[PDB]
Amino acid sequence: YDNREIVMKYIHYKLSQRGYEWDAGDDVESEVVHLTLRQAGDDFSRRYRRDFAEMSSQLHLTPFTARGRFATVVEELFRDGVNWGRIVAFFEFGGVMCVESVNREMSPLVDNIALWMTEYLNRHLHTWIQDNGGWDAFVELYGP
Ligand SMILES: CC(C)c1ccccc1[C@@H]1CCCN1C1CC2(CCN(c3ccc(C(=O)NS(=O)(=O)c4ccc(NC[C@H]5CC[C@](C)(O)CC5)c([N+](=O)[O-])c4)c(Oc4cnc5[nH]ccc5c4)c3)CC2)C1
């Protein structure tokens, strides 16, 4: 299980739900992890549909401030610590930011966001993940 593949494939899925293409992701084109994450993120987005509708209009993305927007949101999200729900929330947020970046003619940001997600995965969330039994724990809990 490779965190960059998990990130790439999740963003590819979010972009495809809006009919948007992505070059960095055709390249990479463990499957149970991606399915479970797809399903979990979709459910999270139905549960929080009205809040996501508001967050999409209030991201205020620009090429020079999107990094700080990402960091602000993600640090607030993990303020109480880490759990599976908040990791899915993190993926869904990154998905919404990539969608809005293409939607607002800032397509290049998608490659930056995949970086920051990957980075944040490996630096600040990977320990908790191993220590709670890895991604097969997640597939154990919410899989098909
Ligand atoms: C737009 C906004 C909402 C937002 C989004 C992203 C970032 C920030 C924000 C905003 C910015 C300002 C405030 N901020 C919000 C405050 C905030 C509210 C949300 N909150 C959190 C934090 C943890 C949980 C939480 O319950 N954890 S859990 O017990 O580990 C857990 C429980 C259930 C699942 N899956 C169930 C599974 C799905 C697939 C099925 C259907 O096939 C089978 C069943 C998972 N799981 O990982 O899949 C983990 C949560 O509730 C759910 C309820 N059901 C969910 N289903 C998928 C994820 C998920 C999370 C909300 C975190 C804090 C975020």
Structural summary, described in words:
This protein is mainly α. It has one domain: Blc2-like (Apoptosis Regulator Bcl-x, Orthogonal Bundle). 76% of the residues lie in helices and 0% in strands. It has eight helices and no strands. Helix 3 crosses helix 6 (84-103). The protein is globular. The site of ligand 98I has 20 residues, from helix 3, helix 4, helix 5 and helix 6. It is classed as apoptosis. The entry lists the keywords Inhibitor, apoptosis. The assembly is monomeric. The entry is titled "Crystal structure of Bcl-2 in complex with sonrotoclax". The protein is Apoptosis regulator Bcl-2.
Short description:
The PDB classes it as apoptosis. The entry lists the keywords Inhibitor, apoptosis. This protein has 144 residues and is mainly alpha-helical.
Topology of helices and strands:
Layout: H1 3-17, H2 23-26, H3 31-47, H4 49-57, H5 66-77, H6 84-103, H7 109-131, H8 134-142
Helix pairs in contact: 1-3, 1-6, 1-7, 3-6, 3-8, 6-7
The site of ligand 98I has 20 residues, from helix 3, helix 4, helix 5 and helix 6.
The CATH superfamily label reads Blc2-like
Structural class: mainly alpha
The value of Rg in angstroms is: 14 Å
Distance between the termini: 18 Å
Shape: globular
Total helical elements = 8
Residue fraction in strands: under 5%
| CATH class placement | Mainly Alpha
What number of structural domains do the residues give? 1
Helix content: over 70%
Any idea of the CATH topology? Apoptosis Regulator Bcl-x
Please tally the β strands and state the result: 0
Largest sheet: none
CATH architecture descriptor text: Orthogonal Bundle
Q: What is the succession of H and E elements?
A: HHHHHHHH
**Chemical compounds bound to the protein:** ligand 98I
PDB class: apoptosis
Keywords: Inhibitor, apoptosis
Assembly: monomeric
Entry title: Crystal structure of Bcl-2 in complex with sonrotoclax
